[PDB]
Amino acid sequence: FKPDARFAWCVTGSGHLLDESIALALELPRADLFLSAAAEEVLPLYGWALPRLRKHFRVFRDNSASGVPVGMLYHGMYHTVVIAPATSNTVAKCAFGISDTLPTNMYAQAGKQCIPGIVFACDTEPTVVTQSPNEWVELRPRAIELDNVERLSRFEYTTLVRSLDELKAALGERLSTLDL
């Protein structure tokens, strides 16, 4: 990798722990953001519109079908790919080798080049989504979500994490490895 290589932090269209995920990315020494089309829609709804993101990050939008920004991986510009948060959709696509979004292309190309990937899968446990003070909706991962997490966790050069704490740990191990 180049001496000043960076984290490639991909964001998908997940509202789940989105703010906390960006908060962690903010703590990293050098990271650029790579968005899916859905992320670009979802991020403004949770406090992270593009103009705010660009105060802190270089931000690459998903505006090509071929995933043109992934070409930077060939130039040693990114030492690690992160997907956080990862929608169930993106976990499914990664697990089956589908790459038709910027984050799934970044992940697949990283793997082909033996670049470490860290994937924060957010559908491993039940959760609660509230609308009013005394009304809420419980979400429960389905068999397919759980199976896809298991599938992806077995991938080469991939650390699948299931919580913010574990994401922090994976990032910390990567930083230690890179002597950063």
Annotated binding-site residues for FMN read: 13-16, 36, 88-90, 99, 105, 109, 112, 131
Q: Note whether 14 and 122 are within 8 A (CB).
A: yes
**What's the closest the beta carbon of residue 130 comes to ligand FMN, in angstroms?**
7
R_g (Cα) of the chain, nearest Å: 16
Residue 163 binds: one of a copy of itself, ligand FMN, none (C-beta under 5 to 8 A by kind): a copy of itself
Q: Which of 1, 15, 50, 146 binds ligand FMN (CB under 6 A)?
A: 15
- How many residues touch ligand FMN under the rule CB under 6 A: the total is 31
Strands 135-139 and 158-161, bridge-based pairing: unpaired
**What's the closest the beta carbon of residue 81 comes to a copy of itself, in angstroms?**
14
- Determine, following the binding rule CB under 6 A, whether residue 111 of this chain makes contact with ligand FMN: no
Structure tokens at 91: 């976990």
- Determine, following the binding rule CB under 8 A, whether residue 97 of this chain makes contact with a copy of itself: yes
Strands 158-161 and 117-121, bridge-based pairing: parallel
HSE value, Cβ hemisphere, 13 Å, CA-based, for 173:
10
Residue span binding a copy of itself (CB under 8 A) among the ranges 2-10, 49-57, 77-85, 141-149: 141-149
User: 14: which residues sit within 8 A by CB, 6+ positions away?
Assistant: 39, 42, 85, 86, 87, 122
**What's the closest the beta carbon of residue 147 comes to ligand FMN, in angstroms?**
15
**What's the closest the beta carbon of residue 128 comes to a copy of itself, in angstroms?**
4
Q: Note whether 106 and 82 are within 8 A (CB).
A: no
Listed residue (8, 17, 16, 15) closest to 43, CA to CA: 15
Footprint on this chain of a copy of itself (rule: CB under 8 A): 13, 36-38, 40-42, 64-68, 74-75, 87-89, 91-93, 95-101, 105, 108, 111-114, 123, 125-129, 131, 136-145, 147-148, 155-156, 161-163, 165-166, 168-170, 172-173
